Every structure is written in C-alpha cells, then in structure tokens.
C-alpha cells in the first residue's frame, strides 16, 4: 500500500493562550526508515507569539522504523488510515492538547490538525520563546482498551542550560480492525533545521526507530 | 456599568476526541447573587456523543456573590472586560482545555469560547453519557504572576454511585489593571434543570458565592 | 464515646529528603466544635532543616463539628478507632506520604504517625523555611471503593507573598465497619501560634467545621 | 580503585499502607557490564501482603555501563558514595516514597533503604499481588540547579494482559563535588530470577546501559 517514498501535507489550526494562528505545510519523507522532513509555514495568526518548538511533534508514526518482530500499528491502518489525539502536559502548567486525522491519497499523507494551548504564563519559556530544542526522547507504546497509546516524557532545552520538562499522553486510532503490537518503545529525535526571523517558515526533520528495549543480531557476523 | 439583573449570549466551538461542535446560548442572571441562568441550543456536531456535563462548567465570574470585605477582580474588569483560560483534567485521563474571551455590550456579556478535550477512552463515563451531575465545589483563588488564578478539584457522581474526580486550574486575565485581591474562595453550585432526550436543548443555573473560608451576633 | 473534653498524646517518626528526626506531642480538643490544640516537642534529629508547615497538617477528623444531617464517619468508629493514610504533593516536586493511627485509651487519642518527604530542592521554599502559615481550606470527602476518602488542594503562603500549593490525598479506613456518609465537604483552619527559634516547641491549633457546601 | 567485581550488602526498613516491613539482602554485580544480582529475604512484617514488585527497582547507579562520550556521575562519586531520594507515582494513586544512602566498604556497596508506599487500593493490582514484571525501560538523566536527575516513567505487566503505569522522580546527590553529565538515557531491565510462594526470598537481577538517544 505503501511506497519507500511518500508526500505530506498538512494543516494546523489551533490556539495558545485563546490567540487562535493556522499553518500548512508540505514535505516527504520515508517510512521505512523512520525519516521525513517538511516545510511550515504561518497563514494566520503569525507572527505566532510562542515559542515555535510547542508545534514541533504535532507535525505521523509511520515515520518510524519498524522490525519485522515488532508490529506496525501504523503502516498496517493503510489505506484507511488512523487518527491520533494527545494532550502535552507541561512542566509549568501550560497545556496543549492536539488533534490529527491522517488519510492517504495516493502518495500524500493529509493531516487535519487541531491545537489547544493554555495556562502559559507570561514569564515562562514558551511565551517569551526561550526554548531551543526538543532532546531525543523514547516513547513507550502499550495497548489500552483495544487501543495503541504513547507516553512520552521529555524536556525542551533553553538558552543558557537547563531543561522544561514535558509529559506526552497520545491515543492512537487506526480506523480498520488491525493487528495489536506488544509493549515497546519507539526513539525520538525531532529536529528544525532551518527556519526565518518569525518563524513563518521552518525547516523541519524527525527520525524515528522502533525497538524492544534491553534484549543482540551483533554475532560479529 | 452592571445592572442588578443583566442577559448573557455565547457561541462555543469545539471538540471532543477529535468529533467537532457549536453550542450557542442566551440567559440572564443576577451578578450580586451570584445567580445566572441559560439555554443553550447545540447548532453542530449533535448528537453530541459525549457527557454533556463537561461544557456546564464552561459555559463567567461575575455571576459571585462578592462580600465588600474581599476584592472582586470580575466585576472590576468592567467594561472593558476579561478573558479567562482553564484546564480540566479528568480523573482518568480525558483532558479538557477551555477558552473564554468576555466583553459586555450595553447590559448583555458576550463569550466566546472555545473547548477541546482529548483522550477520554471509550469505557469512560464522558464518552458513555454515565455522568449525573456536578456536586457543589468550592474553588481557591489565588494571585500569581500579576493575574488571578483559580484552582478547584471536585468530582461528578455516576448512575451506579460513585465520583468522577476533575481538576480545574483557571486563569483569569483582565484586560484593564485592576485590584488585585487576597487568597478567597468561591463556593459553586451547578445544575441542569431541564434538557431535551439527546441534550440538544438544555437549561442550565448556577449559584456561586464568594467568602475567606473559617471565620451570628444575633444582634 | 467521645466526650465533649479529651486530650491527645503522640508521637512521629519519619524523615525528610532522608534525614531522619522524631516528634511527640501532647494537647486537648473538642469533638463537638472542631477545635483542637496541642503542644509538640522535637525529640530527635533537631534542628529541623525544613520548614515545619509541612508536618502541622499530619498532627484527626475527630475533631471537626458535624451537623445532625452529615453522618460523622470518626466519632462512630470509636471507640474501636481507626487510620489513614495520605500523600501530599507539592508543586514544585516534593512528596509527603504520611500515615497516622487512632486509638483510644480512656480519655485521649494516641497518635502512632509516620511521614516521608523526598525530592525538596535546596532552593525551595521547604529546604529554606519560607513558609508562613497553611491558608485555610476546604476537604472535599467521598466513597470511594468501599473506603471514605479526604481530597484537598490548598496552599503555603510564603513570606515575600505567594503561594505554594499542595495536592492531599487522604484514605480514612475506620478499624471496625461504620455507616458510610455521602459527598460533603469539612473546612480547615490550621495555625501555629506560638513557637521557639528553631521549632523546638510549636503551639498547634485547628479549627473545622462540616458542610454540605452551597444549596 | 574499584574493581570488576563488587559485592552488595543490604538492609530496607519500611511501610506500605501503615504496615511495616524489613528486607536484607546481599549480592553482587559488575559496574563496568550494568549488571548486577541478589538476594533478598523479608526479615519483619513477613509474609508481605503487597506485591513484591513496588520494591525490586529500590533495591544503585553505578550499575550502568557508560561510554567514554557520557560523563559518569557515579562511578565518580566513590570513595566518597552518594544518595538518592525517588518518588513512584503509580496511575491508580499509589505512591511510593524512598531513600536510599550508599556506602563503600572495601569491594562491597551498603545500602540504607527506607520506604514508604501509601494510598495503594484493596482491589487495585499492587494488594492483590496480580503483577509479573517491570517492563524494560530508558531513564531520563538531567541536571537541575546542581544536582543529577533521573526521570522514567513506566508499567508493570500485570497477570492477564495489560500495563499498570508508574512514573519515577530520582533526585540523585554524590557526597562528594562531582562532573554533571549532560541529558543522556539509561535502559533498564529488571527480572525476578528466583523467588518463594511468600517472597520470603527473591533472587533479583538488573541490567544497564547508558546512551544520549538516537542521533
């Protein structure tokens, strides 16, 4: 169903803080090998007034690595496809929950996106946009109620050291009866490479792998 | 600027697990009893395939009985107004982020708000309409950070018995520098009066009043 | 069971981000107007280099007036008495778990308590003693598992203004089956009137009153 | 001057729901392999009426194989030792609190454990014992105002199928100034080897590494 190559675009609407902004967004990515890149871009709200990294995740698991002895929720939902919502706990109060609605068409995945921010005070590091970049995470997916889930926790590097500290919680419902995985983990590591003064375009990559934990196929042969 | 009796309109937008709708209301109410009334008509996404009882709470401050021995920062947000946003977060798991931008036109508030909430499993209570109702809370208001905060954890009672525990961290944002008070509370009473089979119709009142917690002279 | 005049007598052992310490304690209260004070003494590792607000709350629903049409889940389970448990959670990390057990023998309650604290930071308002007083509050308790709990979310104010709040998390397990009350709620009022330099001695009052909340 | 090879003696003292509860124990490890052995027999408030699990992952850092490119915060605090206090928040309210001061003697570790764990339902898996094992897991390691955190959140495979989630708050204190990493990982696999009806022994296994992620 699925090619080594396929095409994403997206659109965001959302609110932080009750300031409501949208972004779209194209990109390509590879879902064989956990990797994919894309370009955003602000179309309303801009020029967004909080730190650019609270998007970042938001913007597909497919896009992650998968071993034969571990099953794939996501490329097995295909063509139909699978929905996702989760809400990202912040360490400071501010919370985001996010909504994704993923289908195919061809060789594009559409993303529908919803995006909920609140309680962000002013002094923090997401209104004043301190936050430099999302460390590598692991995430651990289980099976809850005939349903894949994700929870994540990490933290978001600031200028001058330190660390804000985040708690994931994601559903994720594919839209076909499929096959369950067993309890197993899935390493993050999200990336924007390039990006302009406000933000209003932004480079943007993630690879991602699948694994089982502390088992290797390492017999120096 | 605040009439003793004083009308409300709004249109909420917003979803649940992902399933989008809008609810518009009109009521009135008493701002220095701290009672307020409502109807409220869903306009999209009905049937609402959710608890009804997690927008009750969302659908304005002003509506407290204020003792003058303690500041109220509502009613002196007028008539500029304030905005206000809030978490609820569900016993279980189910998250529910609200929005709520207040201005008055001549005698009637007008809010816009928006509502999202997320991961409420299908088991649950909210996505099996097994809620029966809100029991009266009492909400901790506090200043942080040169705005008001409101905190309250309450619960919702089950048909088979039982509570659904949710906690509410509120943020309140007046938009004009006003006063701002000391550590107070407010006690809340919500309840539903009258609402139609799928709650496509529903009545809704709500007394609240504010006080300083552990304080009758017959005289 | 209990009459309108009883004392307490205590003792607590516990530690706070692992350094140990102990406390007895010895005062008087009236079940029928929910007020209490007591006497407490450091008895072990003292000084205390934590702010002492955080013990105040831990040293008995026994004490709180309830109306005819509330059922008092604590004065009914006497004199077989009960326990509790509770977890206290604070915003910037700290945890507190603490358990207390009531007995009756005579005239007094003898308090059996122990408590936990981990992960205060240095900086924190707990490591540095910047606590003033518990603001007052309001229990919200319910049924729930066959068990009466006790949920609380209230505050510290802090010196230089502020406040630092607190997530309780209480179990009331009578030791003998007793008939069990509906959702209601009990408002608090704790404070330390009088006091030593370094907490050595610390004069505890509590006030509480029971409630069904608004009508 | 800390060899290959190193053994482990052990005492926990502690509580869960207000009753009480002694373990030691004794063992054996490799530091520089993340891997390590015991044993552990109950020696106060036997047979333990809560599931053996809660307390397998209190029962030492060094423990972890650490590349040249991270920073070894605790192969660097001997022969000095260090502490460590950790919060387990477990998703149905149980909350387990603890304490942990290391010691060398020699070739051997000495740990003085203390634990407290509250709030954990009848019905709920932890009192009825229905959990099988900890599932492998990757640690979070970060400084924060001086001092080494670590932070995982994870499951218990419980009997019958499903995931019973507890998330762990680690502050980590050497006795001694010491290198701070920068953020890094520590995967985590933990097994009852061996064990009686009871509990009353339990032969406990650890394995770890350390990694900064996926590049």
Redesign the interface.
């Known amino acids: 169903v699925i090619k080594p190559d396929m095409k994403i675009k997206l659109r965001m609407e959302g ?1 932080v ?2 300031h409501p902004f949208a972004i779209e967004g194209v990109g390509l990515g590879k879902p064989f090998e956990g990797k994919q890149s894309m370009d955003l871009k602000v179309k309303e709200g801009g020029p967004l007034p909080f730190a650019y990294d609270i998007l970042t995740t938001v913007f597909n698991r497919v896009f992650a690595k998968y071993p034969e002895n571990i099953v794939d929720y996501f490329k097995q939902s295909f063509p139909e496809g699978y ?1 996702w ?3 990202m ?1 912040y360490e400071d ?1 501010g ?5 994704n ?1 993923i289908t195919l068409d061809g060789d594009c995945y559409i993303y529908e996106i ?1 995006f ?4 962000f ?3 923090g590091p997401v209104m004043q946009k301190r936050t430099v970049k999302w ?4 995430e ?1 997916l ?6 894949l889930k994700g ?1 994540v ?3 978001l ?1 600031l200028e001058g050291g ?2 804000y ?1 985040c ?1 994931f ?3 994720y419902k594919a839209k076909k009866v499929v096959q369950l995985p067993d ?1 197993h ?1 899935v ?3 999200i990336e924007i490479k390039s990006h302009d003064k406000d933000y209003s375009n932004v480079n943007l990559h993630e ?3 699948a694994h ?3 088992p290797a196929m390492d017999e120096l042969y």
């Open positions: 609110a803080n009750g929905s919502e989760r809400s706990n109060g919370i985001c929950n996010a909504t609605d919803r909920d921010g609140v309680n005070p002013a002094n460390e590598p995470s692991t651990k289980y099976v809850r109620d005939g349903v929870d926790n990490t933290a590097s330190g660390h500290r708690d919680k994601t559903t309890y983990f390493d993050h590591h690879h991602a792998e089982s934990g502390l």
